[PDB]
Design a protein around this ligand. Structure first.
Ligand SMILES: Cc1[nH]c(C(=O)Nc2nc3c(O[C@@H](C)c4ccccc4)cc(C(=O)O)cc3s2)c(Cl)c1Cl
Ligand SMILES: [Ca+2]
Length: 184
């Protein structure tokens, strides 16, 4: 039910003007990667602010399940990204979101626009790795400001590194060629 989110985003992501809601978009995706670390599946998270102002979060966890969900008739990954904070809220309020999954020897991908899948999750190659990459462009129709602040992200990643000592958290800002490694 992502229509309701796109109609009243403040109720799901918080303040869409003061920068708190915008950065909550990144935090929600990072929190999913952190949950993979808490369960003992993930020990590296890479958070990138791209030149195009998009943000990528890569983990080396199990990868979001790709098998069809019987109740929905689509990949589990699509059900997680499209049905109702939940990464589906990030998807709903993103002009574009690109999902890559490394799982069971295969690379899977899906792209969305305002949370609508452009095509069903598809196999695009082979991999010896496991994990999830989410890259998203926050919607300017939802957020009055869309530029991520490296200092706001860094402070939260420092906290998460402290609270999750076994996880190597890499922060990259391509706009200023910054890389910081947080690892307790
Ligand atoms: C950056 C990033 N990483 C992840 C990420 O790794 N999530 C994973 N979730 C699972 C998992 O729960 C699924 C079925 C589930 C997720 C949400 C709500 C209800 C259900 C099950 C399994 C499994 O059984 O193997 C694996 C994973 S990995 C997300 Cl989401 C984002 Cl965003
Ligand atoms: Ca620059």
């Amino acid at each position: 039910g992502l229509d309701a989110v796109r109609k009243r985003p403040g109720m799901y992501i918080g303040d869409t003007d003061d920068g708190t809601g915008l950065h909550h978009m990144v935090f929600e995706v990072v929190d999913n990667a952190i949950d993979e670390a808490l369960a003992g599946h993930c020990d590296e998270i890479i958070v990138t602010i791209h030149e195009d102002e998009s943000v990528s979060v890569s983990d080396n966890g199990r990868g979001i399940p790709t098998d069809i969900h019987p109740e929905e008739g689509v990949s589990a990954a699509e059900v997680i990204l499209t049905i109702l904070v939940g990464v589906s809220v990030v998807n709903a309020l993103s002009s574009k979101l690109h999902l890559t999954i490394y799982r069971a020897g295969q690379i899977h991908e899906q792209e969305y626009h305002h949370g609508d899948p452009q095509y069903p999750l598809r196999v695009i190659g082979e991999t010896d790795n496991t994990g999830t990459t989410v890259r998203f462009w926050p919607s300017a129709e939802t957020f009055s400001q869309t530029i991520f602040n490296v200092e706001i992200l860094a402070r939260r990643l420092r906290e998460l590194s402290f609270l999750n000592a076994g996880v190597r958290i890499v922060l990259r800002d391509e706009r200023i060629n910054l890389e910081h490694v947080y690892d307790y």
